[PDB]
Coordinates of C-alpha atoms and ligand atoms in Angstrom, one line a residue:
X1 CA 0.1 2.5 33.5
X2 CA -2.4 5.2 32.5
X3 CA -4.9 3.2 30.5
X4 CA -7.8 5.0 28.7
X5 CA -10.7 3.7 26.7
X6 CA -13.2 6.3 25.6
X7 CA -14.1 8.5 22.5
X8 CA -12.5 11.9 22.1
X9 CA -14.0 14.7 20.1
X10 CA -13.6 18.6 20.0
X11 CA -16.3 19.7 22.5
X12 CA -19.2 21.7 21.0
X13 CA -18.5 24.7 23.5
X14 CA -14.8 24.9 22.4
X15 CA -13.4 27.3 19.7
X16 CA -10.3 27.1 17.4
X17 CA -8.0 29.6 19.2
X18 CA -4.8 28.8 17.1
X19 CA -3.9 26.7 14.1
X20 CA -1.0 26.0 11.7
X21 CA -2.8 24.6 8.6
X22 CA 0.7 24.9 6.8
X23 CA -1.1 26.6 3.8
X24 CA 2.0 28.7 2.8
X25 CA 4.9 26.8 1.2
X26 CA 8.5 27.6 2.4
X27 CA 9.9 28.4 5.8
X28 CA 7.5 27.8 8.8
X29 CA 5.8 30.9 10.0
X30 CA 8.1 32.6 12.5
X31 CA 5.1 34.0 14.3
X32 CA 4.1 30.4 15.3
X33 CA 7.4 28.3 15.4
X34 CA 10.9 28.7 16.6
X35 CA 13.9 26.4 15.9
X36 CA 15.6 24.8 18.9
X37 CA 19.4 24.8 18.2
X38 CA 20.2 25.2 22.0
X39 CA 22.0 21.7 22.5
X40 CA 23.5 21.4 18.9
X41 CA 27.2 21.9 19.9
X42 CA 27.0 19.8 23.2
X43 CA 24.9 16.9 21.9
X44 CA 21.1 16.5 22.6
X45 CA 19.7 14.6 25.6
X46 CA 18.8 10.8 25.6
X47 CA 22.2 10.0 23.9
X48 CA 20.4 11.4 20.7
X49 CA 22.5 11.4 17.5
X50 CA 20.9 14.3 15.5
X51 CA 22.0 17.9 14.7
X52 CA 18.8 20.1 14.6
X53 CA 19.2 22.4 11.5
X54 CA 17.4 25.9 11.7
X55 CA 16.2 27.7 8.6
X56 CA 17.3 24.7 6.5
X57 CA 14.6 23.6 4.0
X58 CA 16.3 20.1 3.6
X59 CA 15.2 19.5 7.2
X60 CA 12.3 21.9 7.8
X61 CA 10.0 23.1 5.0
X62 CA 6.2 23.7 4.4
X63 CA 5.3 21.7 1.2
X64 CA 1.9 20.6 -0.4
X65 CA 0.0 21.6 2.8
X66 CA 2.3 19.8 5.3
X67 CA 5.2 20.8 7.6
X68 CA 8.0 18.5 6.5
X69 CA 10.6 17.5 9.2
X70 CA 13.3 15.4 7.4
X71 CA 16.2 13.4 8.9
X72 CA 19.3 12.9 6.6
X73 CA 22.7 11.2 7.0
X74 CA 25.0 14.2 6.5
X75 CA 27.6 16.1 8.6
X76 CA 26.7 19.8 8.7
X77 CA 30.3 20.7 9.5
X78 CA 29.9 24.3 8.1
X79 CA 27.4 25.2 10.9
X80 CA 28.9 27.3 13.8
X81 CA 26.9 25.2 16.3
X82 CA 27.8 21.8 14.6
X83 CA 28.5 19.1 17.3
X84 CA 30.1 16.3 15.2
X85 CA 26.6 14.6 14.5
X86 CA 26.2 12.1 11.7
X87 CA 22.5 13.0 11.1
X88 CA 20.5 16.2 10.6
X89 CA 16.9 16.7 11.5
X90 CA 14.4 19.4 12.6
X91 CA 12.9 20.6 15.9
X92 CA 10.2 23.4 16.0
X93 CA 8.4 24.7 19.1
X94 CA 5.9 27.4 20.0
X95 CA 8.0 28.3 23.1
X96 CA 7.8 32.1 23.6
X97 CA 5.2 32.4 20.8
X98 CA 2.1 30.3 21.7
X99 CA 1.3 28.3 24.9
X100 CA -2.1 27.0 26.4
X101 CA -3.6 26.2 29.7
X102 CA -6.2 23.4 29.0
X103 CA -7.5 22.6 25.5
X104 CA -8.1 20.0 22.8
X105 CA -4.9 19.8 20.7
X106 CA -5.2 17.9 17.3
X107 CA -2.1 17.1 15.2
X108 CA -2.7 15.2 11.9
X109 CA 0.6 13.6 10.9
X110 CA 2.3 10.9 8.7
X111 CA 5.3 9.7 10.7
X112 CA 9.1 9.3 10.0
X113 CA 10.0 5.5 9.8
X114 CA 13.3 3.6 9.9
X115 CA 15.3 1.9 12.7
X116 CA 16.7 5.0 14.7
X117 CA 13.9 7.4 13.8
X118 CA 12.1 8.9 16.9
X119 CA 9.3 11.2 15.7
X120 CA 7.5 13.1 18.5
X121 CA 4.6 15.6 19.1
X122 CA 4.8 16.8 22.7
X123 CA 4.5 19.7 25.1
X124 CA 6.5 21.3 28.0
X125 CA 5.4 24.0 30.6
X126 CA 6.3 27.6 29.7
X127 CA 7.3 28.0 33.4
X128 CA 10.5 25.9 33.6
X129 CA 11.4 27.1 37.2
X130 CA 10.8 23.6 38.9
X131 CA 13.1 21.9 36.3
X132 CA 12.9 18.5 34.6
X133 CA 10.7 16.6 35.2
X134 CA 8.8 18.6 37.8
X135 CA 7.7 21.3 35.3
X136 CA 5.3 18.7 33.6
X137 CA 5.5 17.3 30.1
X138 CA 2.9 15.8 27.7
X139 CA 3.8 13.4 24.9
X140 CA 0.7 13.4 22.6
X141 CA 2.6 11.0 20.2
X142 CA 5.8 9.1 20.5
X143 CA 6.9 6.3 18.1
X144 CA 10.2 4.4 17.7
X145 CA 10.4 3.1 14.2
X146 CA 11.9 -0.4 15.2
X147 CA 8.3 -0.8 16.6
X148 CA 6.7 1.5 14.0
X149 CA 2.9 0.6 14.4
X150 CA 3.0 1.4 18.2
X151 CA 2.0 4.9 19.3
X152 CA 3.0 6.0 22.8
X153 CA 1.2 8.7 24.9
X154 CA 2.8 9.7 28.2
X155 CA 2.9 12.5 30.9
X156 CA 6.1 13.4 32.9
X157 CA 5.9 14.9 36.5
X158 CA 8.2 14.9 39.6
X159 CA 6.1 12.0 41.1
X160 CA 5.6 10.2 37.8
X161 CA 8.4 9.4 35.2
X162 CA 6.5 5.9 38.1
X163 CA 6.0 7.0 34.4
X164 CA 2.2 7.4 33.5
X165 CA 1.7 6.2 29.9
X166 CA -0.2 4.0 27.5
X167 CA 0.2 2.7 24.0
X168 CA -2.0 1.7 21.0
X169 CA -1.5 0.7 17.3
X170 CA -2.3 2.5 14.1
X171 CA -2.4 1.4 10.4
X172 CA 0.8 2.2 8.4
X173 CA 1.5 5.4 10.5
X174 CA 4.5 6.4 8.3
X175 CA 2.5 5.8 5.0
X176 CA -0.8 7.4 6.0
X177 CA -2.1 10.3 8.1
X178 CA -3.6 9.9 11.6
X179 CA -4.9 12.5 14.1
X180 CA -2.9 12.4 17.4
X181 CA -4.9 14.3 20.0
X182 CA -4.9 15.6 23.5
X183 CA -7.9 16.6 25.5
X184 CA -6.6 18.4 28.6
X185 CA -8.9 20.0 31.3
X186 CA -8.4 20.9 35.0
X187 CA -9.8 17.4 35.8
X188 CA -7.9 15.0 33.4
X189 CA -6.0 14.4 30.2
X190 CA -7.0 12.0 27.4
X191 CA -4.5 11.2 24.6
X192 CA -5.8 9.4 21.5
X193 CA -5.5 8.5 17.8
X194 CA -8.4 9.0 15.3
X195 CA -11.1 10.0 17.9
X196 CA -10.3 7.3 20.5
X197 CA -8.5 7.9 23.8
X198 CA -6.0 5.0 24.7
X199 CA -4.4 7.1 27.6
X200 CA -6.2 8.7 30.6
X201 CA -4.4 10.7 33.3
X202 CA -6.5 12.3 36.1
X203 CA -5.9 15.2 38.4
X204 CA -6.1 13.7 42.0
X205 CA -7.3 17.3 42.9
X206 CA -4.7 17.2 45.9
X207 CA -3.1 20.6 44.9
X208 CA 0.3 18.9 44.7
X209 CA 2.6 20.2 41.9
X210 CA 4.4 16.8 41.9
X211 CA 1.3 14.9 40.7
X212 CA -0.6 17.7 38.8
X213 CA 1.8 20.3 37.4
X214 CA -0.8 21.0 34.6
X215 CA -2.7 24.0 36.0
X216 CA -0.3 26.3 34.0
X217 CA 0.4 26.8 30.2
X218 CA 2.3 24.4 27.9
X219 CA 3.9 25.0 24.5
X220 CA 4.1 22.4 21.6
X221 CA 7.1 20.7 20.1
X222 CA 7.5 18.8 16.8
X223 CA 10.8 16.9 16.0
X224 CA 12.4 13.7 14.7
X225 CA 15.2 12.5 17.1
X226 CA 17.5 9.7 15.9
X227 CA 18.9 7.1 18.3
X228 CA 18.1 7.0 22.0
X229 CA 14.7 5.2 22.4
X230 CA 14.6 5.2 18.5
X231 CA 20.3 3.2 13.3
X232 CA 19.7 1.9 9.6
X233 CA 21.8 4.2 7.2
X234 CA 19.6 2.8 4.4
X235 CA 16.5 4.3 6.2
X236 CA 17.6 7.9 5.3
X237 CA 16.2 10.3 4.4
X238 CA 13.0 9.9 6.3
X239 CA 10.3 12.6 7.1
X240 CA 7.4 13.3 9.4
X241 CA 4.5 15.2 7.6
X242 CA 2.3 17.5 9.7
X243 CA -0.9 18.4 7.7
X244 CA -2.1 20.6 10.6
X245 CA -2.0 21.6 14.3
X246 CA -5.3 22.9 15.7
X247 CA -5.7 24.0 19.4
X248 CA -9.3 24.4 20.8
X249 CA -10.4 26.0 24.2
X250 CA -13.8 26.6 25.9
Ligands
LIG301 O1 19.1 15.3 32.1 C1 18.7 16.5 32.9 C2 18.3 17.5 31.9 O2 17.0 17.2 31.3 C3 16.5 18.1 30.4 O3 15.2 17.5 30.1 C4 15.2 16.6 29.0 C5 15.5 15.2 29.5 O4 16.9 15.0 30.0 C6 15.2 14.1 28.5 O5 15.3 12.8 29.1 C7 13.8 14.2 27.9 O6 13.4 13.5 26.8 C8 12.0 13.5 26.3 C9 11.1 12.5 27.0 O7 11.0 12.8 28.3 C10 9.7 12.5 26.4 O8 9.1 13.7 26.8 O9 9.6 12.5 24.9 C11 10.5 13.5 24.3 C12 10.4 13.6 22.8 O10 10.6 12.2 22.4 C13 11.9 13.3 24.7 O11 12.8 14.2 24.1 O12 13.6 15.6 27.4 C14 13.8 16.6 28.3 C15 13.6 18.0 27.7 O13 14.5 18.4 26.7 C16 16.4 19.4 31.1 O14 15.8 20.3 30.2 C17 17.7 19.9 31.6 O15 17.4 21.1 32.4 C18 18.3 18.9 32.5 O16 19.6 19.2 32.9
LIG302 CA1 -2.5 21.4 5.8

């Protein structure tokens, strides 16, 4: 419903303004990522089945130049925020550490596969005041591992949820790295894989928050949900590998 078909590349007049190359093995860098544990006791949205474990290397660890977000079948019943979940996973975001208004975002990633796995790379507005989905949301990459070659790119607004999205295919996305990218300006968003936009969403320039809520900063989110849109017990453990995040601006 938001088709695109054009090349995408880091413009020559843009600079790298922030990156996690994941050069440093161990815990993610607390200056760049926080853990989101906020709905662990209550259960996450979308009828999701995962517990998101914070400072737990079995779920979130930097290893051989990659962020590793790993889902496991275990019950983390010793955690004070445990919510009876049958699976653990990771969710990191830049919320309250780094956000961006416009930019070329590049995430190079090998995905987490298995029926139930729902790896994502997505953004939400730092200003949450208008609520969901009015605040505006950008899914650079969504995949559901019962359809594991298909890459989804979508935006969420008050007027559109009407959802504006598109899809493409990539070669063994869980067994090789691709670059999932967003090119966001005041005029439009492209979302692509490997230098090709398969998704285009234009600003109608009508100054209407319901249709263009993207004249304000967004933060970035990395996670593997389990269930919802994504359960094969044999598929665990499974992991998303992020080689780098790079953000460029004029
Ligand atoms: O249900 C009302 C609550 O919504 C919270 O927002 C959630 C929303 O409910 C949920 O459907 C949604 O899920 C995401 C998809 O929209 C898409 O962006 O891809 C994501 C990654 O796969 C997926 O998680 O996420 C929203 C944000 O957590 C509100 O935050 C809450 O205030 C409200 O009561
Ligand atoms: Ca790296």
